[PDB]
Design a protein around this ligand. Structure first.
Ligand SMILES: O=P(O)(O)OC[C@H]1O[C@@H](n2cnc3c(NCc4ccco4)ncnc32)[C@H](O)[C@@H]1O
Ligand SMILES: O=P(O)(O)OC[C@H]1O[C@@H](n2cnc3c(NCc4ccco4)ncnc32)[C@H](O)[C@@H]1O
Lengths: 126, 131
């Protein structure tokens, strides 16, 4: 299995420890895949080859939204992880994209992100 | 002509006034489908409504200075729908634009225009007269 992981970079890195914990655990379930022109090309090539796309969508970010948009049109199964504890309200375009097994948006408490990812890959992935 | 405009909402509303200026100017060149940008459980409806608008749109315009999930998502869908896209970014803000947005630039099909505020209306006039 190949897992594409999205997180905020130029959108801000406030949740980057959370991203390392997500990436470490995604490694229990598959290979984790992840000149602006070359950066876009490289990541698109990875998105196109990915078996599942996982995105942490608490910190707003153009690139994360952009990767989710391209992934949905590709038909790739998607998991978005949102942290309501931030005090943020999740983008309507993201939470509203939710659609069966194809696109799921899970709210999480940060002390449980590892166990939620365990649950997703165990029972919520086709 | 139908025009889809993208601008941050829950990504933050600090560029609101400017979105109003953009939408007002965009009106001169087509009907702006996503009027709400200038101005629960129901998010499902919004996504459906906005994708419908996106499929119908002749051109997608996005002000990409404020980082936004929804804006990036709209841009992502629009590229996949083969839509002609204009992105507008303000280097004054002290932001660095997403490499995924800048790196998506592709001839006349996907453009990213750096501009100074006070100049946004003029830049909109330049794009539509040309393309
Ligand atoms: O926040 P942008 O808006 O910065 O979102 C970052 C997302 O888009 C991708 N991405 C953005 N920039 C890069 C990137 N460039 C290095 C870099 C340095 C500074 C910004 O970006 N390399 C690899 N992936 C990138 C990542 O996969 C993230 O999920
Ligand atoms: O930064 P934000 O993430 O939340 O994402 C921005 C995009 O999200 C879209 N959007 C979000 N809410 C609405 C919205 N809400 C009003 C509404 C309620 C019911 C139907 O319409 N109307 C139109 N577009 C919306 C806009 O096209 C914005 O460009």
């Amino acid at each position: 299995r190949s897992v594409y992981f999205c997180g905020s970079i130029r959108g801000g890195r406030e949740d980057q420890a959370l991203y390392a914990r997500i990436v470490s655990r995604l490694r229990r379930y598959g290979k984790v895949l992840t000149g602006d022109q070359f950066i876009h090309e490289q990541n698109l090539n990875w998105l196109q080859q990915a078996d599942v796309v996982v995105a942490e969508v608490t910190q707003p970010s153009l690139g994360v939204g952009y990767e989710l948009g391209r992934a949905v049109a590709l038909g790739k199964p998607i998991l978005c992880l949102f942290r309501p504890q931030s005090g943020r309200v999740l983008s309507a375009m993201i939470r509203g994209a939710a659609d069966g097994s194809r696109f799921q948006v899970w709210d999480y408490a940060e002390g449980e992100v590892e166990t939620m990812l365990d649950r997703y890959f165990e029972a919520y992935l086709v």
